[PDB]
Amino acid sequence: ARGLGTARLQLVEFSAFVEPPDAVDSYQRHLFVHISQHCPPPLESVDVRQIYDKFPEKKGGLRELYDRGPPHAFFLVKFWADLNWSSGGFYGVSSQYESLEHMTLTCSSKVCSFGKQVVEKVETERAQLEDGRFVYRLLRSPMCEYLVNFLHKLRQLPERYMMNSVLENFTILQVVTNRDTQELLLCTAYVFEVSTSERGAQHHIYRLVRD
Ligand SMILES: CCCCCCCCCCCCCC(=O)O
């Protein structure tokens, strides 16, 4: 793999953002995190066993997911989030995938704290046939309230190193499956640090492997 995806399903763009109330007047959004793969060296690898404890146990945990396979569909994304941006704006998440196959997708996003699942969001999205390939658009999903509240608290911490200590215990697991066949298509584990404002958001993608 040279990016986040397989031959069956590719991530095109992913982002989490806030538009301030003013946006109606002069548009603007702040990206907390953001992946853009609008384009065509193999990724680095990380053994999945090192991150087992950072995600839930039993059904829906990394070990049982990896065991069910397929192994090539598992990725780890490290985000340096930009928490420099404010009261009543719109907080949103947007995702877009592509495949050659027409499918109906189920996307499950699990927020975990100290490796225990804290909240879950499950969504389905049917293929739209555009330009020989199929596109899946989950755009402008309102950010769930736990996460907006978490962000507002985090941003007020007096020191970056304490934000990093707190974020050390906060992870997100995304499982995309073929809603009709139950086949897993993509599983992405996210881990987080804060960036330094002068540096906006950045990320690094790894393949999750298993010796
Ligand atoms: C430290 C800020 C965390 C970054 C904001 C979340 C970005 C990762 C994906 C969030 C998707 C979760 C879907 C949801 O639960 O609303």
PDB file of C-alpha atoms and ligand atoms in Angstrom:
ATOM      1  CA  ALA A   1       0.000   0.000   0.000  1.00  0.00           C
ATOM      2  CA  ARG A   2       1.199   3.507  -0.920  1.00  0.00           C
ATOM      3  CA  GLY A   3      -1.736   5.308   0.749  1.00  0.00           C
ATOM      4  CA  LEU A   4      -4.742   4.713   2.957  1.00  0.00           C
ATOM      5  CA  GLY A   5      -6.794   2.230   0.968  1.00  0.00           C
ATOM      6  CA  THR A   6      -6.969  -1.089  -0.806  1.00  0.00           C
ATOM      7  CA  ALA A   7      -7.846  -2.088  -4.349  1.00  0.00           C
ATOM      8  CA  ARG A   8     -11.425  -2.392  -3.058  1.00  0.00           C
ATOM      9  CA  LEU A   9     -11.895   0.931  -1.257  1.00  0.00           C
ATOM     10  CA  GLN A  10      -9.721   4.042  -1.145  1.00  0.00           C
ATOM     11  CA  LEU A  11      -9.978   6.997   1.177  1.00  0.00           C
ATOM     12  CA  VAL A  12     -10.135  10.162  -0.928  1.00  0.00           C
ATOM     13  CA  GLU A  13     -10.434  12.880   1.689  1.00  0.00           C
ATOM     14  CA  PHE A  14     -11.072  13.049   5.408  1.00  0.00           C
ATOM     15  CA  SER A  15     -11.336  16.053   7.683  1.00  0.00           C
ATOM     16  CA  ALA A  16     -12.729  17.368  10.953  1.00  0.00           C
ATOM     17  CA  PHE A  17     -13.356  21.077  11.148  1.00  0.00           C
ATOM     18  CA  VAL A  18     -15.156  24.025  12.678  1.00  0.00           C
ATOM     19  CA  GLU A  19     -16.740  26.921  10.830  1.00  0.00           C
ATOM     20  CA  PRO A  20     -17.178  30.004  13.061  1.00  0.00           C
ATOM     21  CA  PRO A  21     -20.598  31.697  13.204  1.00  0.00           C
ATOM     22  CA  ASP A  22     -19.151  34.457  11.010  1.00  0.00           C
ATOM     23  CA  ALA A  23     -18.720  31.924   8.173  1.00  0.00           C
ATOM     24  CA  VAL A  24     -22.122  32.989   6.800  1.00  0.00           C
ATOM     25  CA  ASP A  25     -20.581  36.444   6.233  1.00  0.00           C
ATOM     26  CA  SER A  26     -17.065  35.578   5.000  1.00  0.00           C
ATOM     27  CA  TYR A  27     -16.556  31.842   4.674  1.00  0.00           C
ATOM     28  CA  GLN A  28     -13.752  30.106   6.548  1.00  0.00           C
ATOM     29  CA  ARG A  29     -13.132  26.787   8.306  1.00  0.00           C
ATOM     30  CA  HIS A  30     -10.424  25.584  10.678  1.00  0.00           C
ATOM     31  CA  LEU A  31      -9.149  22.048  10.093  1.00  0.00           C
ATOM     32  CA  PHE A  32      -8.366  20.114  13.267  1.00  0.00           C
ATOM     33  CA  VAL A  33      -7.104  17.140  11.211  1.00  0.00           C
ATOM     34  CA  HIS A  34      -7.169  16.429   7.481  1.00  0.00           C
ATOM     35  CA  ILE A  35      -6.158  13.703   4.988  1.00  0.00           C
ATOM     36  CA  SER A  36      -6.271  14.381   1.235  1.00  0.00           C
ATOM     37  CA  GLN A  37      -5.352  11.651  -1.254  1.00  0.00           C
ATOM     38  CA  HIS A  38      -6.437  13.361  -4.490  1.00  0.00           C
ATOM     39  CA  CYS A  39      -3.463  11.801  -6.339  1.00  0.00           C
ATOM     40  CA  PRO A  40      -1.780   8.453  -7.227  1.00  0.00           C
ATOM     41  CA  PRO A  41       7.223   4.313  -2.019  1.00  0.00           C
ATOM     42  CA  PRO A  42       5.341   1.859   0.224  1.00  0.00           C
ATOM     43  CA  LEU A  43       4.047   3.049   3.559  1.00  0.00           C
ATOM     44  CA  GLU A  44       5.927   2.345   6.749  1.00  0.00           C
ATOM     45  CA  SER A  45       4.675  -0.498   8.936  1.00  0.00           C
ATOM     46  CA  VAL A  46       3.753  -0.874  12.621  1.00  0.00           C
ATOM     47  CA  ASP A  47       3.060  -4.176  14.326  1.00  0.00           C
ATOM     48  CA  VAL A  48      -0.597  -4.139  15.382  1.00  0.00           C
ATOM     49  CA  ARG A  49       0.190  -5.932  18.652  1.00  0.00           C
ATOM     50  CA  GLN A  50       1.842  -2.757  20.012  1.00  0.00           C
ATOM     51  CA  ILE A  51      -1.496  -0.885  19.864  1.00  0.00           C
ATOM     52  CA  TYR A  52      -3.833  -3.674  21.031  1.00  0.00           C
ATOM     53  CA  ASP A  53      -4.371  -2.170  24.493  1.00  0.00           C
ATOM     54  CA  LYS A  54      -5.273   1.277  23.101  1.00  0.00           C
ATOM     55  CA  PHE A  55      -8.565  -0.036  21.672  1.00  0.00           C
ATOM     56  CA  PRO A  56     -11.514  -2.042  23.058  1.00  0.00           C
ATOM     57  CA  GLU A  57     -11.553  -5.737  23.870  1.00  0.00           C
ATOM     58  CA  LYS A  58     -13.877  -8.511  22.743  1.00  0.00           C
ATOM     59  CA  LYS A  59     -16.119  -7.853  19.722  1.00  0.00           C
ATOM     60  CA  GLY A  60     -14.950  -4.836  17.761  1.00  0.00           C
ATOM     61  CA  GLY A  61     -11.433  -4.824  19.193  1.00  0.00           C
ATOM     62  CA  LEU A  62      -8.325  -4.629  17.020  1.00  0.00           C
ATOM     63  CA  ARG A  63      -7.187  -8.174  17.749  1.00  0.00           C
ATOM     64  CA  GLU A  64     -10.499  -9.783  16.851  1.00  0.00           C
ATOM     65  CA  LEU A  65     -10.825  -7.488  13.831  1.00  0.00           C
ATOM     66  CA  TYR A  66      -7.339  -8.264  12.541  1.00  0.00           C
ATOM     67  CA  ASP A  67      -7.945 -11.972  13.151  1.00  0.00           C
ATOM     68  CA  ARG A  68     -11.062 -11.854  10.968  1.00  0.00           C
ATOM     69  CA  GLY A  69      -9.068 -10.057   8.268  1.00  0.00           C
ATOM     70  CA  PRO A  70      -8.142  -9.260   5.637  1.00  0.00           C
ATOM     71  CA  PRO A  71      -4.792  -8.074   7.013  1.00  0.00           C
ATOM     72  CA  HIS A  72      -4.006  -5.694   4.153  1.00  0.00           C
ATOM     73  CA  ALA A  73      -7.001  -3.495   5.081  1.00  0.00           C
ATOM     74  CA  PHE A  74      -5.556  -2.244   8.416  1.00  0.00           C
ATOM     75  CA  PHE A  75      -3.913   1.172   8.839  1.00  0.00           C
ATOM     76  CA  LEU A  76      -2.687   3.422  11.639  1.00  0.00           C
ATOM     77  CA  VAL A  77      -2.879   7.203  11.294  1.00  0.00           C
ATOM     78  CA  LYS A  78      -0.987   9.532  13.617  1.00  0.00           C
ATOM     79  CA  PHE A  79      -2.493  13.017  13.686  1.00  0.00           C
ATOM     80  CA  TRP A  80      -0.871  16.142  15.023  1.00  0.00           C
ATOM     81  CA  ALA A  81      -4.125  18.022  15.562  1.00  0.00           C
ATOM     82  CA  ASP A  82      -4.345  21.809  15.285  1.00  0.00           C
ATOM     83  CA  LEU A  83      -6.310  23.082  18.296  1.00  0.00           C
ATOM     84  CA  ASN A  84      -5.779  26.809  17.625  1.00  0.00           C
ATOM     85  CA  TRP A  85      -8.983  28.518  16.470  1.00  0.00           C
ATOM     86  CA  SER A  86     -14.853  30.821  19.965  1.00  0.00           C
ATOM     87  CA  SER A  87     -18.276  29.537  21.073  1.00  0.00           C
ATOM     88  CA  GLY A  88     -21.161  28.587  18.792  1.00  0.00           C
ATOM     89  CA  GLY A  89     -19.715  27.465  15.462  1.00  0.00           C
ATOM     90  CA  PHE A  90     -20.473  24.358  13.420  1.00  0.00           C
ATOM     91  CA  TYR A  91     -18.261  21.324  14.149  1.00  0.00           C
ATOM     92  CA  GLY A  92     -18.212  18.765  11.368  1.00  0.00           C
ATOM     93  CA  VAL A  93     -16.569  15.677   9.949  1.00  0.00           C
ATOM     94  CA  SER A  94     -16.425  14.834   6.245  1.00  0.00           C
ATOM     95  CA  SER A  95     -15.309  11.590   4.585  1.00  0.00           C
ATOM     96  CA  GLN A  96     -15.204  10.387   0.987  1.00  0.00           C
ATOM     97  CA  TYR A  97     -14.176   7.013  -0.432  1.00  0.00           C
ATOM     98  CA  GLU A  98     -13.977   5.520  -3.910  1.00  0.00           C
ATOM     99  CA  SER A  99     -14.045   2.006  -5.358  1.00  0.00           C
ATOM    100  CA  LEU A 100     -14.436   0.247  -8.688  1.00  0.00           C
ATOM    101  CA  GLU A 101     -17.247  -1.815  -7.117  1.00  0.00           C
ATOM    102  CA  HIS A 102     -20.817  -0.660  -6.475  1.00  0.00           C
ATOM    103  CA  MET A 103     -21.503  -1.312  -2.778  1.00  0.00           C
ATOM    104  CA  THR A 104     -23.420  -0.083   0.228  1.00  0.00           C
ATOM    105  CA  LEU A 105     -20.943   0.813   3.007  1.00  0.00           C
ATOM    106  CA  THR A 106     -21.363   0.712   6.781  1.00  0.00           C
ATOM    107  CA  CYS A 107     -18.910   3.063   8.526  1.00  0.00           C
ATOM    108  CA  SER A 108     -18.502   2.647  12.291  1.00  0.00           C
ATOM    109  CA  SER A 109     -16.451   5.185  14.269  1.00  0.00           C
ATOM    110  CA  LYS A 110     -15.513   4.295  17.879  1.00  0.00           C
ATOM    111  CA  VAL A 111     -14.095   6.840  20.320  1.00  0.00           C
ATOM    112  CA  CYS A 112     -12.031   5.146  23.032  1.00  0.00           C
ATOM    113  CA  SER A 113     -10.656   6.498  26.315  1.00  0.00           C
ATOM    114  CA  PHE A 114      -7.936   4.460  28.033  1.00  0.00           C
ATOM    115  CA  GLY A 115      -8.691   1.782  25.453  1.00  0.00           C
ATOM    116  CA  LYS A 116     -12.372   1.506  26.460  1.00  0.00           C
ATOM    117  CA  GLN A 117     -15.027   2.460  23.944  1.00  0.00           C
ATOM    118  CA  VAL A 118     -16.734   5.663  25.054  1.00  0.00           C
ATOM    119  CA  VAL A 119     -19.021   6.499  22.116  1.00  0.00           C
ATOM    120  CA  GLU A 120     -19.864   4.960  18.752  1.00  0.00           C
ATOM    121  CA  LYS A 121     -21.412   6.290  15.550  1.00  0.00           C
ATOM    122  CA  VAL A 122     -22.620   3.958  12.781  1.00  0.00           C
ATOM    123  CA  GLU A 123     -23.605   5.223   9.311  1.00  0.00           C
ATOM    124  CA  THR A 124     -24.437   3.634   5.964  1.00  0.00           C
ATOM    125  CA  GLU A 125     -23.764   5.119   2.556  1.00  0.00           C
ATOM    126  CA  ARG A 126     -24.711   3.862  -0.885  1.00  0.00           C
ATOM    127  CA  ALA A 127     -22.463   4.156  -3.935  1.00  0.00           C
ATOM    128  CA  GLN A 128     -22.927   6.978  -6.442  1.00  0.00           C
ATOM    129  CA  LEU A 129     -21.698   6.138  -9.964  1.00  0.00           C
ATOM    130  CA  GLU A 130     -19.559   9.020 -11.224  1.00  0.00           C
ATOM    131  CA  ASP A 131     -16.842   8.738 -13.894  1.00  0.00           C
ATOM    132  CA  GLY A 132     -16.472   4.983 -14.266  1.00  0.00           C
ATOM    133  CA  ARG A 133     -15.838   4.610 -10.517  1.00  0.00           C
ATOM    134  CA  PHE A 134     -18.145   4.779  -7.522  1.00  0.00           C
ATOM    135  CA  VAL A 135     -18.028   7.521  -4.907  1.00  0.00           C
ATOM    136  CA  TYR A 136     -19.217   7.400  -1.276  1.00  0.00           C
ATOM    137  CA  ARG A 137     -19.852  10.809   0.286  1.00  0.00           C
ATOM    138  CA  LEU A 138     -20.356  11.231   4.030  1.00  0.00           C
ATOM    139  CA  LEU A 139     -19.983  15.009   4.081  1.00  0.00           C
ATOM    140  CA  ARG A 140     -20.586  17.564   6.852  1.00  0.00           C
ATOM    141  CA  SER A 141     -21.638  15.086   9.554  1.00  0.00           C
ATOM    142  CA  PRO A 142     -22.200  17.109  12.754  1.00  0.00           C
ATOM    143  CA  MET A 143     -19.492  16.292  15.276  1.00  0.00           C
ATOM    144  CA  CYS A 144     -20.924  14.412  18.206  1.00  0.00           C
ATOM    145  CA  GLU A 145     -21.301  16.410  21.407  1.00  0.00           C
ATOM    146  CA  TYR A 146     -18.765  14.441  23.460  1.00  0.00           C
ATOM    147  CA  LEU A 147     -16.088  15.373  20.953  1.00  0.00           C
ATOM    148  CA  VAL A 148     -16.999  19.055  20.709  1.00  0.00           C
ATOM    149  CA  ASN A 149     -16.978  19.321  24.517  1.00  0.00           C
ATOM    150  CA  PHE A 150     -13.677  17.412  24.683  1.00  0.00           C
ATOM    151  CA  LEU A 151     -12.122  19.779  22.140  1.00  0.00           C
ATOM    152  CA  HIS A 152     -13.230  22.859  24.052  1.00  0.00           C
ATOM    153  CA  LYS A 153     -11.740  21.526  27.292  1.00  0.00           C
ATOM    154  CA  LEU A 154      -8.495  20.331  25.679  1.00  0.00           C
ATOM    155  CA  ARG A 155      -7.827  23.682  24.002  1.00  0.00           C
ATOM    156  CA  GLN A 156      -7.877  25.405  27.404  1.00  0.00           C
ATOM    157  CA  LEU A 157      -5.125  23.253  28.982  1.00  0.00           C
ATOM    158  CA  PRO A 158      -2.177  25.449  30.068  1.00  0.00           C
ATOM    159  CA  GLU A 159       0.580  23.416  28.383  1.00  0.00           C
ATOM    160  CA  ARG A 160       1.015  21.435  25.183  1.00  0.00           C
ATOM    161  CA  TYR A 161       2.662  18.617  27.086  1.00  0.00           C
ATOM    162  CA  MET A 162      -0.480  18.133  29.197  1.00  0.00           C
ATOM    163  CA  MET A 163      -2.621  18.075  26.044  1.00  0.00           C
ATOM    164  CA  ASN A 164      -0.308  15.359  24.728  1.00  0.00           C
ATOM    165  CA  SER A 165      -0.546  13.396  28.008  1.00  0.00           C
ATOM    166  CA  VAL A 166      -4.363  13.545  27.835  1.00  0.00           C
ATOM    167  CA  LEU A 167      -4.394  12.676  24.116  1.00  0.00           C
ATOM    168  CA  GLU A 168      -2.106   9.736  24.854  1.00  0.00           C
ATOM    169  CA  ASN A 169      -5.196   7.998  26.257  1.00  0.00           C
ATOM    170  CA  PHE A 170      -7.672   8.979  23.498  1.00  0.00           C
ATOM    171  CA  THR A 171      -8.003   6.964  20.288  1.00  0.00           C
ATOM    172  CA  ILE A 172     -10.470   6.494  17.415  1.00  0.00           C
ATOM    173  CA  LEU A 173     -11.108   3.256  15.518  1.00  0.00           C
ATOM    174  CA  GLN A 174     -12.894   3.332  12.124  1.00  0.00           C
ATOM    175  CA  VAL A 175     -14.260   0.138  10.561  1.00  0.00           C
ATOM    176  CA  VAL A 176     -15.710   0.290   7.023  1.00  0.00           C
ATOM    177  CA  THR A 177     -17.552  -2.861   5.918  1.00  0.00           C
ATOM    178  CA  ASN A 178     -19.620  -4.001   2.975  1.00  0.00           C
ATOM    179  CA  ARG A 179     -23.091  -3.667   4.505  1.00  0.00           C
ATOM    180  CA  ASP A 180     -24.430  -6.563   2.426  1.00  0.00           C
ATOM    181  CA  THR A 181     -21.621  -9.137   2.790  1.00  0.00           C
ATOM    182  CA  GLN A 182     -20.248  -8.082   6.199  1.00  0.00           C
ATOM    183  CA  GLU A 183     -16.774  -8.067   4.603  1.00  0.00           C
ATOM    184  CA  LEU A 184     -14.400  -5.609   6.213  1.00  0.00           C
ATOM    185  CA  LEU A 185     -13.056  -3.166   3.640  1.00  0.00           C
ATOM    186  CA  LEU A 186     -10.958  -0.735   5.681  1.00  0.00           C
ATOM    187  CA  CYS A 187      -9.983  -0.501   9.341  1.00  0.00           C
ATOM    188  CA  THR A 188      -8.158   2.629  10.503  1.00  0.00           C
ATOM    189  CA  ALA A 189      -6.779   3.259  14.012  1.00  0.00           C
ATOM    190  CA  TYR A 190      -6.123   6.904  14.884  1.00  0.00           C
ATOM    191  CA  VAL A 191      -3.722   8.165  17.577  1.00  0.00           C
ATOM    192  CA  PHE A 192      -3.242  11.830  18.422  1.00  0.00           C
ATOM    193  CA  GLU A 193      -0.805  14.513  19.488  1.00  0.00           C
ATOM    194  CA  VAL A 194      -1.279  18.275  19.325  1.00  0.00           C
ATOM    195  CA  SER A 195       0.524  20.359  16.730  1.00  0.00           C
ATOM    196  CA  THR A 196       1.899  23.884  17.338  1.00  0.00           C
ATOM    197  CA  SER A 197      -0.413  26.296  15.476  1.00  0.00           C
ATOM    198  CA  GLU A 198       2.450  27.689  13.382  1.00  0.00           C
ATOM    199  CA  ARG A 199       2.390  24.127  12.098  1.00  0.00           C
ATOM    200  CA  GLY A 200      -1.133  23.304  11.084  1.00  0.00           C
ATOM    201  CA  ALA A 201      -2.470  19.765  11.124  1.00  0.00           C
ATOM    202  CA  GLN A 202      -0.345  16.911   9.854  1.00  0.00           C
ATOM    203  CA  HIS A 203      -0.575  13.139   9.783  1.00  0.00           C
ATOM    204  CA  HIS A 204       1.505  10.055   9.074  1.00  0.00           C
ATOM    205  CA  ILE A 205       0.007   6.827   7.676  1.00  0.00           C
ATOM    206  CA  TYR A 206       1.351   3.343   8.465  1.00  0.00           C
ATOM    207  CA  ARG A 207       0.320  -0.156   7.455  1.00  0.00           C
ATOM    208  CA  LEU A 208      -0.619  -2.333  10.447  1.00  0.00           C
ATOM    209  CA  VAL A 209       1.115  -5.711  10.139  1.00  0.00           C
ATOM    210  CA  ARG A 210       1.657  -8.860  12.148  1.00  0.00           C
ATOM    211  CA  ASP A 211       4.771 -11.010  12.385  1.00  0.00           C
TER     212      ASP A 211
HETATM  213  C1  LIG B   1      -8.010  16.020  19.339  1.00  0.00           C
HETATM  214  C2  LIG B   1      -9.096  16.304  18.311  1.00  0.00           C
HETATM  215  C3  LIG B   1      -9.686  15.015  17.750  1.00  0.00           C
HETATM  216  C4  LIG B   1      -9.829  15.210  16.252  1.00  0.00           C
HETATM  217  C5  LIG B   1     -11.290  15.294  15.839  1.00  0.00           C
HETATM  218  C6  LIG B   1     -11.751  13.903  15.419  1.00  0.00           C
HETATM  219  C7  LIG B   1     -11.095  13.494  14.110  1.00  0.00           C
HETATM  220  C8  LIG B   1     -10.970  11.989  13.947  1.00  0.00           C
HETATM  221  C9  LIG B   1     -12.233  11.389  13.350  1.00  0.00           C
HETATM  222  C10 LIG B   1     -13.484  11.780  14.120  1.00  0.00           C
HETATM  223  C11 LIG B   1     -14.645  10.934  13.619  1.00  0.00           C
HETATM  224  C12 LIG B   1     -15.588  10.590  14.753  1.00  0.00           C
HETATM  225  C13 LIG B   1     -17.035  10.545  14.290  1.00  0.00           C
HETATM  226  C14 LIG B   1     -17.810  11.023  15.490  1.00  0.00           C
HETATM  227  O1  LIG B   1     -17.747  10.335  16.540  1.00  0.00           O
HETATM  228  O2  LIG B   1     -18.474  12.099  15.458  1.00  0.00           O
END
